[PDB]
């Protein structure tokens, strides 16, 4: 909205804050550059495993992100479905613990 004369002030402040932080960083780099004077292999699969754990548990976390807003608007049936969601999530988690995908062991 652009007509409530206080949230539009907050929007202007937010946009100016963003653009002036970016401008401050740009001008700091510009001052660093201008002033001062001049003169095969492969990593692993465990990094992929932990990043895949991050993204999969992140989507299973965004489901709880959506749930946590309506935690009191929804009833106990919402608690039951979130409980079985977290239960199967922890079942997969303890599967990853007990198999050994979640350990490093250097």
């Amino acid at each position: 909205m652009s007509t409530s004369t206080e949230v539009i002030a907050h929007h202007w402040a937010f946009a100016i804050f963003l653009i002036v932080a970016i401008g401050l960083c740009c001008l700091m780099l510009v001052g660093g550059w201008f002033l001062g004077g001049r003169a095969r292999l492969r990593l692993s699969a465990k990094f992929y495993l932990v990043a895949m754990f991050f993204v999969i548990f992140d989507v299973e976390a965004l489901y709880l992100f959506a749930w946590s807003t309506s935690i009191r608007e929804s009833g106990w049936v919402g608690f039951v479905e979130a409980a079985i969601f977290i239960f199967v999530l922890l079942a997969g988690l303890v599967y990853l613990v007990r198999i050994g995908a979640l350990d490093w062991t250097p």
Binding site: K46, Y48, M52, I56, V59, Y63, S70, I71, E73, G92
Partner: protein
């Protein structure tokens, strides 16, 4: 706030156009990151705050992270394909782009002619999405949890090394 939507859409189109026709993939992933940022700005311009929040939380915060992980992991620099430059030639670039432009022309002919009340304000809060997502969509979240579990299980089964060490050479068929 329609000007922000137009600017975000234009720079999203330009960013994904530079994604399609770039040589090395790290700048392609960076352009796709700013394309996802522009798509999130489009989401914020249409009142879908939770959608853009999930776009930079997950789509620009977990998926591109995984792509950059793989790129910096197996040390690909686009080599042995970037010396060919086959996608900067008419015989490869003209055909499929013509086919996709025909698809675009017919689908935007399908877009036009529909009645349009127009995009209004009243942004959809994440609270309403939480009510609907754990309301009529219980089976959606449970079976999507099982979908993510299945994807985790498969990519663990396929993308595990079974070797040792944090540095491994690209040996043919892993001996």
């Amino acid at each position: 706030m329609e000007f922000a939507f137009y600017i975000c859409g234009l720079i999203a189109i330009l960013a994904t156009l530079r994604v399609i026709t770039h040589t090395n993939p790290v700048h392609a992933l960076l352009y796709l990151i700013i394309s996802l940022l522009a798509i999130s700005g489009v989401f914020f311009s249409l009142g879908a705050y939770f959608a853009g929040a999930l776009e930079i939380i997950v789509y620009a915060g977990a998926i591109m992270v995984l792509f950059v992980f793989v790129v910096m992991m197996l040390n690909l620099g686009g080599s042995e394909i970037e010396q060919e430059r086959q996608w900067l030639k008419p015989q490869v670039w003209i055909g499929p782009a013509i086919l996709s432009a025909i698809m675009l022309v017919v689908i935007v002919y399908a877009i036009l002619g529909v009645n349009d009340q127009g995009i209004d304000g009243t942004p959809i809060s994440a609270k309403a999405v939480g009510i609907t997502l754990f309301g009529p969509y219980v089976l959606a979240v449970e079976l999507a949890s099982m979908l993510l579990l299945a994807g985790l299980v498969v990519a663990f089964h396929v993308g595990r090394e079974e070797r040792a060490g944090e540095v491994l050479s690209n040996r043919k068929d892993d001996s």
